């Protein structure tokens, strides 16, 4: 066994600066959300827009996770619960969480 | 004259003057004050209707700022529009 | 003189309710609200016209501005109100 | 298979590790996908309206940064 190795992984991911989620499913999700509501066919996405949107989404998610984890350890437990995240979204504000 | 050409209540001349003096653009079109008058009329009508319903619910014909606060908070889109502003003499919602 | 929007708020109030009234404090609230919303819509239209190298504020600009600024079904009613109003204005 | 299922459990797990989370739950993998969909939809709505205002049949990174600037959380790097 290699116990307590997760902390080093956390340090690595704080050290790294690359995108965490892959490119193809996020791009397909972008195409699907596009054709889901625009009521039009064949809307093209430039290359920089995809990677920019992915970087922004990962930034928003990591901010939400660090805030939620702080308020969970404030509550008295080290496990993140979805009720805490939903509470976090409305405790941040209209522009900060939504 | 040609004031109430759009059949609305807001003046086309004042909003045109405000757009020309606000320096938002070099030139301004002619349908834009009409469109602005329509949207301002619709929003004001909605908020005054909700305030009138709240005041009728409170058995008062003189709408006080508390009634406007209830009219804004009882709806769901109005708070998303006015989340960045607050109302003077406005109490908090009854939890 | 002083610029205000008191008469138009009074007109639409008496049109939607022929009995109710608005206090003087609430009248100023409505005036400041109208000014703030008008400034927001105007700033949005200004930056959107700057983003397409256009020096004119057409009906397309104001519609796109009010759609991306007003969320919800109120936007879908307001666009119909504006299009109906401009057709009513140009129908002379 | 739904496309939102493409956001794998290790992907959100690595997101949480970068966020500083030690232990994660089970419903996290179902709620985070929903909030990511909501956030992305709110951005993409502003972006596609920005495209539709102009005579463009396609989106670009300019509309994206316009959408994020409109929402408040601005993003640098792609403004030129």
């Amino acid at each position: 066994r290699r116990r307590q190795g997760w902390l080093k992984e956390i340090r690595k991911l704080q050290k790294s600066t690359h995108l965490l989620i892959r490119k193809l499913p996020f791009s397909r999700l972008a195409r699907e959300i596009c054709v889901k509501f625009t009521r039009g066919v064949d809307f093209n996405w430039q290359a920089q827009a995809l990677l920019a949107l992915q970087e922004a989404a990962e930034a928003f998610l990591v901010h939400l996770f660090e805030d939620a984890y702080l308020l969970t350890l404030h509550a008295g437990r080290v496990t993140l619960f979805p009720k805490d995240v939903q509470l976090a979204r409305r405790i941040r504000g209209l522009e900060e969480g939504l | 004259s040609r004031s109430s050409r759009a059949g609305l209540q807001f003046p086309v001349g004042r909003v045109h003057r405000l757009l020309r003096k606000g320096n938002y653009a070099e030139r301004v079109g002619a349908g834009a004050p009409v469109y602005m008058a329509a949207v301002l009329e619709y929003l004001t009508a909605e908020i005054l209707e909700l305030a009138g319903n709240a005041a009728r619910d409170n058995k008062k014909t003189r709408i006080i700022p508390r009634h406007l606060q209830l009219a804004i908070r009882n709806d769901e889109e109005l708070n998303k529009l006015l989340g960045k502003v607050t109302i003077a003499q406005g109490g908090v919602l009854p939890n | 003189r002083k610029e205000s929007y008191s008469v138009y708020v009074y007109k639409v109030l008496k049109q939607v309710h022929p009995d109710t009234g608005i206090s003087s404090k609430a009248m100023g609230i409505m005036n400041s609200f109208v000014n703030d919303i008008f400034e927001r819509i105007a700033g949005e239209a200004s930056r959107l016209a700057h983003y397409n190298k256009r020096s004119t504020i057409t009906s397309r600009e104001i519609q796109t501005a009010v759609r991306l600024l007003l969320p919800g079904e109120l936007a879908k009613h307001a666009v119909s109100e504006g299009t109906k109003a401009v057709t009513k204005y140009t129908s002379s | 298979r739904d496309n939102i299922q493409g956001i794998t459990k290790p992907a959100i797990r690595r997101l949480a590790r970068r966020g500083g989370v030690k232990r994660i739950s089970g419903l996290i993998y179902e709620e985070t996908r929903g909030v990511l969909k909501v956030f992305l939809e709110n951005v993409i709505r502003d972006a596609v309206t920005y495209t539709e205002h102009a005579k463009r049949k396609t989106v670009t990174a300019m509309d994206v940064v316009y959408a994020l600037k409109r929402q408040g959380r601005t993003l640098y790097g792609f403004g030129g």
Binding site: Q86, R89, R90, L98 | D75, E76, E77, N79, K80 | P71, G72, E73, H77 | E31, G34, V38, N42
Partner: peptide, 18 residues
């Protein structure tokens, strides 16, 4: 002109997960 009938969602925000 029909006037919109409103409803109260479980969570205050307009967006609803479904």
């Amino acid at each position: 002109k029909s006037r919109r009938i409103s409803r109260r969602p479980s969570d205050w925000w307009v967006v609803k997960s479904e």
